[PDB]
Amino acid sequence: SSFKAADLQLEMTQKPHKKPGPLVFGKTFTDHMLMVEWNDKGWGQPRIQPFQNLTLHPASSSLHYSLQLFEGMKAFKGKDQQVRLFRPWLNMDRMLRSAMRLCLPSFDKLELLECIRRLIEVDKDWVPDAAGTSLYVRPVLIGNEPSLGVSQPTRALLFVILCPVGAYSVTPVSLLADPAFIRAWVGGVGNYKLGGNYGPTVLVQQEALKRGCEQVLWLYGPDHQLTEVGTMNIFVYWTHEDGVLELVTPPLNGVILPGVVRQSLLDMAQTWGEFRVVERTITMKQLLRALEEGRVREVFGSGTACQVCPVHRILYKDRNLHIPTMENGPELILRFQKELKEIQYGIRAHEWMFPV
Amino acid sequence: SSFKAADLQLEMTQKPHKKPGEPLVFGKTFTDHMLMVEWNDKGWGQPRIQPFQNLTLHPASSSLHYSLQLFEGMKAFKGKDQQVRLFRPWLNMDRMLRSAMRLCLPSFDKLELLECIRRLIEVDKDWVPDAAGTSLYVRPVLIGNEPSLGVSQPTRALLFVILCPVGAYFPGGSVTPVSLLADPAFIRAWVGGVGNYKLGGNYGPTVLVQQEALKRGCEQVLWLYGPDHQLTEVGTMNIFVYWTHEDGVLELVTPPLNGVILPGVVRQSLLDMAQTWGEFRVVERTITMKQLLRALEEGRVREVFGSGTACQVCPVHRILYKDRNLHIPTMENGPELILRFQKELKEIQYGIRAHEWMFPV
Ligand SMILES: *Cc1c(COP(=O)(O)O)cnc(C)c1O
Ligand SMILES: *Cc1c(COP(=O)(O)O)cnc(C)c1O
Ligand SMILES: O=C(O)Cc1noc2ccccc12
Ligand SMILES: O=C(O)Cc1noc2ccccc12
Ligand SMILES: [Cl-]
Ligand SMILES: [Cl-]
Ligand SMILES: [Cl-]
Numbered sequence A: 001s002s003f004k005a006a007d008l009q010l011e012m013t014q015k016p017h018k019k020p021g022p023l024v025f026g027k028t029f030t031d032h033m034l035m036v037e038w039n040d041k042g043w044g045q046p047r048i049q050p051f052q053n054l055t056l057h058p059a060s061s062s063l064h065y066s067l068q069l070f071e072g073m074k075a076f077k078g079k080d081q082q083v084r085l086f087r088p089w090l091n092m093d094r095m096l097r098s099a100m101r102l103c104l105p106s107f108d109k110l111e112l113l114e115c116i117r118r119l120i121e122v123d124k125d126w127v128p129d130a131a132g133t134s135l136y137v138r139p140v141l142i143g144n145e146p147s148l149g150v151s152q153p154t155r156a157l158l159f160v161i162l163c164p165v166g167a168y169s170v171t172p173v174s175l176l177a178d179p180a181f182i183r184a185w186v187g188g189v190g191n192y193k194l195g196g197n198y199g200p201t202v203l204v205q206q207e208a209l210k211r212g213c214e215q216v217l218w219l220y221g222p223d224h225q226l227t228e229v230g231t232m233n234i235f236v237y238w239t240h241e242d243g244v245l246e247l248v249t250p251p252l253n254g255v256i257l258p259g260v261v262r263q264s265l266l267d268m269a270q271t272w273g274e275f276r277v278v279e280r281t282i283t284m285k286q287l288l289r290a291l292e293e294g295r296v297r298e299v300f301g302s303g304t305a306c307q308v309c310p311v312h313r314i315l316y317k318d319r320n321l322h323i324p325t326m327e328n329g330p331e332l333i334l335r336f337q338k339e340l341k342e343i344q345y346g347i348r349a350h351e352w353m354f355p356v
Numbered sequence B: 001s002s003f004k005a006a007d008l009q010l011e012m013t014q015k016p017h018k019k020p021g022e023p024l025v026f027g028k029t030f031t032d033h034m035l036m037v038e039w040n041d042k043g044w045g046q047p048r049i050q051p052f053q054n055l056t057l058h059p060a061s062s063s064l065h066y067s068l069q070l071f072e073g074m075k076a077f078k079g080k081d082q083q084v085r086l087f088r089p090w091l092n093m094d095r096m097l098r099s100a101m102r103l104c105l106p107s108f109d110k111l112e113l114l115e116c117i118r119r120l121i122e123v124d125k126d127w128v129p130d131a132a133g134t135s136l137y138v139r140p141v142l143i144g145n146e147p148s149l150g151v152s153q154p155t156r157a158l159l160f161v162i163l164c165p166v167g168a169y170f171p172g173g174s175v176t177p178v179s180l181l182a183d184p185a186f187i188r189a190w191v192g193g194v195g196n197y198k199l200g201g202n203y204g205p206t207v208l209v210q211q212e213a214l215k216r217g218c219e220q221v222l223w224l225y226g227p228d229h230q231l232t233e234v235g236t237m238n239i240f241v242y243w244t245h246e247d248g249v250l251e252l253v254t255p256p257l258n259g260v261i262l263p264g265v266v267r268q269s270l271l272d273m274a275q276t277w278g279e280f281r282v283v284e285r286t287i288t289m290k291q292l293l294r295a296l297e298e299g300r301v302r303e304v305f306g307s308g309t310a311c312q313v314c315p316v317h318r319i320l321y322k323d324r325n326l327h328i329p330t331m332e333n334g335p336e337l338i339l340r341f342q343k344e345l346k347e348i349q350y351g352i353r354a355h356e357w358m359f360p361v
């Protein structure tokens, strides 16, 4: 049985921290945090407590065998000072799938959300309201076994911390495309937001920077499929081989993290009904022929941190490939950003937004 | 610039745990002290041996969000002469440093860590058991500890070592063979991945699969890879097959280090011993489920086993591939090679035979 928002225990801080004045993504934390413990007696009571360190047994399964998963989502403060979470239900859904994959304890998704709402409420004033700013919400679930056996955890901790953030802005990025690097494999766990999928990318992101690129384009398979950009899903807006203009993104076949922003761009594009929206594999072969025949209009990544990130260059086989994204407006990118902004900041009412 | 064992600070415990009287359960009982070394912008702090205690981590610790974590596992053995010795610890130190570099964690001096570890075991020497088939399991860990959510090279890290007295990994010991679930739906690692490093991230995803092995009546997972169902590893152990190969030659084969195999210290040791004996062909080559099925059908398999620090040499008697229960005749064949490896390792490990492989504490 899940923990209950009704059972929440609140402990306000004695010394509130001084709010910020140029925020650096994920370094500034708010006064409070959520924490819920799990053990053989099930879930304890959730609590909002002052932001404080974790105390873990040195054998903690979180640190030895990566019994760890996370989420990332944003709360936005509208003009009316009202704070809203964007599509949080989908993050709860994904978090639970991640939990099950790692044999971590199940929880009630609406209970956790209410606990998160309550936490954001307590820290409302940390939510910035300046243009392009938001509150980043980082839920985490970790195993906490005090023994070295690789086994289903009998102890777990669920916590949530909050960071006020600005951008991460609408400047295009260059990508290193090198098939030697493989982010995920069919039958793997690339489709879950597990900490173990990110650690190994640090070295690869460094190679990208040495080779004068800003992000990694993760290729998969012998046909060099374009899967993801850094921690973002990848979209290509082009006139396809059959002469039809379309928005394509790779399908959810196991090596793709099902992004919330990704699904939202699909939803928006489908709703407008102005061009084909498809989920289909994208190979470098197709991209090169499309670039050579001038069929490519825009390439970009989607994710919570950047929202929509234009791509202007891919360094593939030591040879730079120009992506004409910015030369094409980037119309679709700008259209996506505008509607998302209007929705997120409450300019248009929308079922996608959850009020705090 | 590494930490130095010369700078070790020792803080003895004021609350020593009662030692075990009852069977040792692997990795559940810990000794009185731990090694702890912190790294940051100033480089490595001073190493310390300190009472066994909890870690204090920032809630944004990159160790918990992006799996900036690696570990090791090695054993100290107490011989008849009551001398405690580590088995080939240099290789573990080598492997740990490789893991660290893969995760952009701070480099250290392998010989300095080894000395610090020696010093720590010396402090808890009375925790080292000496009954037959017992040892002290040593667990070094290195973790990133950046207090920020950026996926980046950490500027803070924590190196620690804890110790566990142990008996056998499986109840019964490496006498009783194990059954394996071999289903291609599960992949432990992939070429271009990080399965060849001892990174926490490789183990988390196996828990669910090990549950499925149990559900289907097996004890461990036989990890298969590729279109041709290559046998890669057994649980957290390397896999060995002793058979008469298709070309009629008696051989010991284990999968090659092509990226999906963790290079086990015991594995290397078994290759080394078997190569030294010069009595049969010893090779590193892929092994497919097709080749095994046929070899078993033609009665060419002698022994199949796992190797690794926790189990040492673990015999296999059954493999459930899809719905076909394959009997593996390891036990009906002695298991002569398994027994020979186990006897030789014991002689070396318990100092019955002085050896360049043992490192005295
Ligand atoms: C988090 C993440 C995304 C984007 O997901 P959103 O829910 O849109 O923020 C894409 N790819 C990977 C690999 C990720 O970890
Ligand atoms: C640790 C480990 C082994 C065996 O390594 P040893 O150094 O022999 O203990 C084998 N396979 C995997 C996957 C491992 O993690
Ligand atoms: O692109 C994203 O927003 C998803 C994401 N996945 O992992 C992250 C780590 C830090 C910041 C952001 C992320
Ligand atoms: O000793 C081994 O077999 C390797 C191993 N790798 O991970 C482990 C966890 C617990 C116990 C043992 C291990
Ligand atoms: Cl929704
Ligand atoms: Cl999926
Ligand atoms: Cl050696």
Ligand SMILES: [Cl-]
Pocket: B196, B257, B258, B259, B261, B263
């Ligand atoms: Cl290797």
